[PDB]
Amino acid sequence: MSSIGTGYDLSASTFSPDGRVFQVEYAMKAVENSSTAIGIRCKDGVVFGVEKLVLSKLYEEGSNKRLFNVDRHVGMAVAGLLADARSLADIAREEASNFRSNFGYNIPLKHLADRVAMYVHAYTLYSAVRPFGCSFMLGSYSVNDGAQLYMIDPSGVSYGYWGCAIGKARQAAKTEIEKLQMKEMTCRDVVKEVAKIIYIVHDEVKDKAFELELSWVGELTKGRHEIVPKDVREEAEKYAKESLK
Amino acid sequence: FEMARTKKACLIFFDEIDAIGGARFDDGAGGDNEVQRTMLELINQLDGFDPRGNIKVLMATNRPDTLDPALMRPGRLDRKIEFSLPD
Amino acid sequence: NQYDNDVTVWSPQGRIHQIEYAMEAVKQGSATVGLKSKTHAVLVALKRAQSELAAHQKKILHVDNHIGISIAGLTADARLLCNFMRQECLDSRFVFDRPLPVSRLVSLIGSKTQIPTQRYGRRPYGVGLLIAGYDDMGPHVFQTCPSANYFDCRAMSIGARSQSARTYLERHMSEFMQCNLDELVKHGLRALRETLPAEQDLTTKNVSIGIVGKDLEFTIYDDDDVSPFLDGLEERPQ
Amino acid sequence: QSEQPLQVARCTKIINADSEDPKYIINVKQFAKFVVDLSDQVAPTDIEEGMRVGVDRNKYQIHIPLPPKIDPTVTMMQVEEKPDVTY
Amino acid sequence: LRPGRLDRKIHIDLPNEQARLDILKIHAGPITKHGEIDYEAIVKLSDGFNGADLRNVCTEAGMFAIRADHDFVVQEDFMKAVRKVADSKKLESKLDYKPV
Amino acid sequence: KPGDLVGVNKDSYLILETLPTEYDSRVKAMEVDERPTEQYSDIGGLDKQIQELVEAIVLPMNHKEKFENLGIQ
Numbered sequence: 001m002s003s004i005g006t007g008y009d010l011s012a013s014t015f016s017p018d019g020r021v022f023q024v025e026y027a028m029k030a031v032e033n034s035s036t037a038i039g040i041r042c043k044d045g046v047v048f049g050v051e052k053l054v055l056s057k058l059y060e061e062g063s064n065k066r067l068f069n070v071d072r073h074v075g076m077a078v079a080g081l082l083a084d085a086r087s088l089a090d091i092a093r094e095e096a097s098n099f100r101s102n103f104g105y106n107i108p109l110k111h112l113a114d115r116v117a118m119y120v121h122a123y124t125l126y127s128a129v130r131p132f133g134c135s136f137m138l139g140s141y142s143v144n145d146g147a148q149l150y151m152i153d154p155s156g157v158s159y160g161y162w163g164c165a166i167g168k169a170r171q172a173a174k175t176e177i178e179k180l181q182m183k184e185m186t187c188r189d190v191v192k193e194v195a196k197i198i199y200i201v202h203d204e205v206k207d208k209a210f211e212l213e214l215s216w217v218g219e220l221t222k223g224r225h226e227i228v229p230k231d232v233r234e235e236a237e238k239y240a241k242e243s244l245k
Numbered sequence: 246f247e248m249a250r251t252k253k254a255c256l257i258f259f260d261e262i263d264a265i266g267g268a269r270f271d272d273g274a275g276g277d278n279e280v281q282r283t284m285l286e287l288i289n290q291l292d293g294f295d296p297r298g299n300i301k302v303l304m305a306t307n308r309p310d311t312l313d314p315a316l317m318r319p320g321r322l323d324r325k326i327e328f329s330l331p332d
Numbered sequence: 333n334q335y336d337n338d339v340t341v342w343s344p345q346g347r348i349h350q351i352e353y354a355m356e357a358v359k360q361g362s363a364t365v366g367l368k369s370k371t372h373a374v375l376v377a378l379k380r381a382q383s384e385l386a387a388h389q390k391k392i393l394h395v396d397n398h399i400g401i402s403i404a405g406l407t408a409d410a411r412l413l414c415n416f417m418r419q420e421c422l423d424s425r426f427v428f429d430r431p432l433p434v435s436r437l438v439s440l441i442g443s444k445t446q447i448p449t450q451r452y453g454r455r456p457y458g459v460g461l462l463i464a465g466y467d468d469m470g471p472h473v474f475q476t477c478p479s480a481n482y483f484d485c486r487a488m489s490i491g492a493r494s495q496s497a498r499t500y501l502e503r504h505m506s507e508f509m510q511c512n513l514d515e516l517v518k519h520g521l522r523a524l525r526e527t528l529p530a531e532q533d534l535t536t537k538n539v540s541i542g543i544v545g546k547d548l549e550f551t552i553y554d555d556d557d558v559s560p561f562l563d564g565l566e567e568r569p570q
Numbered sequence: 571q572s573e574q575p576l577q578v579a580r581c582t583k584i585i586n587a588d589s590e591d592p593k594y595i596i597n598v599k600q601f602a603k604f605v606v607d608l609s610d611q612v613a614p615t616d617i618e619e620g621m622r623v624g625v626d627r628n629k630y631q632i633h634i635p636l637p638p639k640i641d642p643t644v645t646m647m648q649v650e651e652k653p654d655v656t657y
Numbered sequence: 658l659r660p661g662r663l664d665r666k667i668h669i670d671l672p673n674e675q676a677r678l679d680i681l682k683i684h685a686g687p688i689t690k691h692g693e694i695d696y697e698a699i700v701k702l703s704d705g706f707n708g709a710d711l712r713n714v715c716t717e718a719g720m721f722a723i724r725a726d727h728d729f730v731v732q733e734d735f736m737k738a739v740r741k742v743a744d745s746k747k748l749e750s751k752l753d754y755k756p757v
Numbered sequence: 758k759p760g761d762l763v764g765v766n767k768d769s770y771l772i773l774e775t776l777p778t779e780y781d782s783r784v785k786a787m788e789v790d791e792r793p794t795e796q797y798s799d800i801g802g803l804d805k806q807i808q809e810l811v812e813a814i815v816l817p818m819n820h821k822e823k824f825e826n827l828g829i830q
Contacts (some may be wrong), residue, residue: 002344003268003313003334009342010452018754023342028748030346056483057502062435063484083351083449083479086442129450130340130348171740178698178736205805248639248646268334294789314333582782588764588774595779605764605776620786687828712830719829720812728826 002026011127023131024124027154030133031080035207036167037066038194039077039137040177041149045187045218046139048077049194051167051202051210059211067215067227071096071107073140075217075225079167080134080154088132092116109140109148113158121156131156135166141223169201187218191228195236196243212237246290250298258303267311281313288315297321340452350456351449354478357405357458362391363491363527364402365501365520366462366473369511372545373464373471376520377402378491378527379538390552392542396421397549398431398466400542404491405459405478413457416444434465434472435484442480449479460490464544471545489523496526500569513548517541517561522569530568571611573633576624579604584619594632596625607631668757671707674700680708684715690730702739705752714738 012023035051249255336349403410622636
């Protein structure tokens with residue numbers, strides 16, 4: 001089963017009489033271990049809220065960051081193992097960069113998501129390599145394709161979501177989204193909401209301690225994936241803290 | 246294990262478990278069932294709702310590759326020492 | 333166990349034990365401390381050798397005219413990775429001709445290290461690297477794991493019994509930021525000595541320093557100017 | 571009195587039903603249960619629920635319990651007790 | 658296995674969207690709550706649910722009320738419950754495959 | 758009533774009294790008379806896990822009347 005020397009977790013070419021693939025499933029349990037990364041689609045952009053894990057006492061900003069820029073206007077928030085996430089960042093950024101060069105217009109998220117998923121999926125099929133141990137979101141704003149949110153898991157699926165969570169708290173965190181009307185809503189108000197969801201979900205045993213990182217890609221940034229200002233972070237932090245009490 | 250605890254000072258030297266100690270699985274012909282049975286019994290009284298009594302334990306394995314994750318963690322395996330080929 | 337037969341072997345928790353077990357190899361390596369100010373990046377390292385009747389071969393390696401590394405772990409593997417980095421740094425100097433970014437270089441190591449850990453029938457590399465580099469955005473001192481994740485620290489210690497040294501790093505964490513070159517090196521020595529027992533206090537012979545910064549390029553002091561930093565002795569601060 | 575012939579049995583449960591306040595249900599190793607008494611006629615010394623106890627075939631009452639956890643006789647015989655091996 | 662002792666092979670199979678809707682109302686019936694219309698949310702979210710899972714979400718939701726400090730079940734607590742049990746069951750190991 | 762245990766004398770046969778239930782020895786030996794508590798403190802950390810465990814087992818046993826009011830099983 002999990003303790004074995006042939007097939008099961010060694011392979012992923014294996015099937016059980018149920019049909020399952022255990023290795024691809026073990027990769028899914030790996031994304032679960034670290035804290036939540038949420039990314040919410042607005043009709044005007046994407047706002048992310050990520051727990052940025054504080055693994056030491058001698059931190060500087062951007063240390064073990066999970067916010068990546070795939071393209072100029074795509075942000076990528078990862079959850080689960082960061083080792084696998086760095087290799088995934090290089091592959092996604094590379095597919096986007098060449099796209100911009102050739103097509104000369106802003107990469108459609110629907111296209112980018114299909115290509116990275118195929119890559120994850122090529123590894124899950126194979127028993128020759130293991131598959132990535134993280135799950136990620138790509139989120140973007142353009143006026144050539146609209147605001148899009150996509151999610152790619154360790155299996156190799158790409159489907160669009162209008163508000164998603166990956167990481168430990170995601171079953172709880174997702175529920176809070178159904179409460180919110182977020183499909184139509186400014187990116188300014190949604191930052192306040194991603195921050196308050198994270199503060200309440202966190203507990204001292206999903207991970208020791210975190211640093212709040214929120215990111216913009218919307219009408220406010222003018223279609224640029226950038227990190228939120230010091231001002232923005234703090235008011236959204238404040239509202240999270242006041243709601244927490 | 247019970248007999249060991251009651252007497253005054255016991256050392257149970259579990260001798261040479263290579264495949265007589267192996268990790269839990271089932272083949273549907275007999276399985277690892279009989280092997281794991283001894284293994285599991287030793288786990289239930291040791292940790293239990295009663296702890297290990299007056300029982301010291303020494304393990305001899307040539308294969309830690311075989312063993313169950315339960316045995317390998319401390320509370321019956323406090324210190325690992327390799328007595329292997331010498332210098 | 334059989335969560336670590338190959339580096340594709342998952343545990344039910346969802347962790348590869350071989351990559352973790354590769355970190356235990358870094359602990360066998362020699363103690364190295366990485367510190368930064370606002371103008372210098374300083375690497376303080378422990379050199380060991382089999383002949384102490386002979387000069388000890390450096391544990392500080394050349395990567396760029398402003399990048400130097402200190403290795404903790406596997407010696408062959410650290411040198412092996414070093415060559416990929418060296419090729420890229422020197423190439424970056426030809427093409428881009430900036431003083432290359434520590435954050436940029438470090439991610440490329442993350443793609444290569446991932447290859448064997450992803451691949452069956454192979455071993456991870458069990459070496460932890462502390463890189464000092466100075467670009468035009470100031471110093472950065474980065475830690476790269478046996479995995480592929482990086483930390484941008486102000487101070488880090490990976491190596492043998494690195495906890496003892498961190499107790500010092502935690503205590504003067506504020507101080508590092510303000511320093512000049514001299515001050516960075518004395519703190520790293522006071523940290524470095526702690527890893528080792530109470531009754532062992534370093535010599536210049538087994539200390540190599542790689543100094544990087546704004547006022548300087550790349551200079552390695554093996555005993556050259558090591559003696560003044562060592563002075564002002566402090567012996568194993570608890 | 572009533573020890574020998576002492577048939578090996580074991581205490582299945584402690585009841586207080588039928589006859590005296592101390593009453594026990596022992597099941598003999600022929601697989602029939604018996605409701606037995608308890609003797610002070612000679613001192614019971616090793617009694618515990620589920621442990622082997624001894625009852626008589628003439629009048630079934632516990633004269634003396636069998637020693638602690640001798641349920642396997644098989645394990646106990648083979649064991650050496652601390653021999654001297656020279657260095 | 659061959660008929661003449663098992664001529665009728667009736668399989669009590671996994672209850673539908675429509676089936677879950679009526680059964681949840683009955684389940685809803687001893688539950689002290691603010692209100693529940695959430696049946697529709699619960700069915701859409703439910704994947705591979707059998708009768709045991711259905712009774713479970715109702716218990717799991719009531720448990721969250723105790724943390725809240727209310728003997729009245731929130732609408733938020735039913736929604737939280739379906740997703741959670743759904744996630745745990747699939748991830749760990751999926752149901753047994755056998756003739757339907 | 759059939760299935761209940763009753764005594765009979767093996768030498769000459771009368772039902773002395775009726776005997777109450779009987780639980781075999783093999784299960785009896787395994788049992789415990791309850792051993793000292795380590796509590797939540799000795800198992801330091803593991804906070805989220807403790808919160809789930811306490812909610813499921815401990816609060817329904819003690820405050821079982823409230824749990825009937827919630828309606829839950």
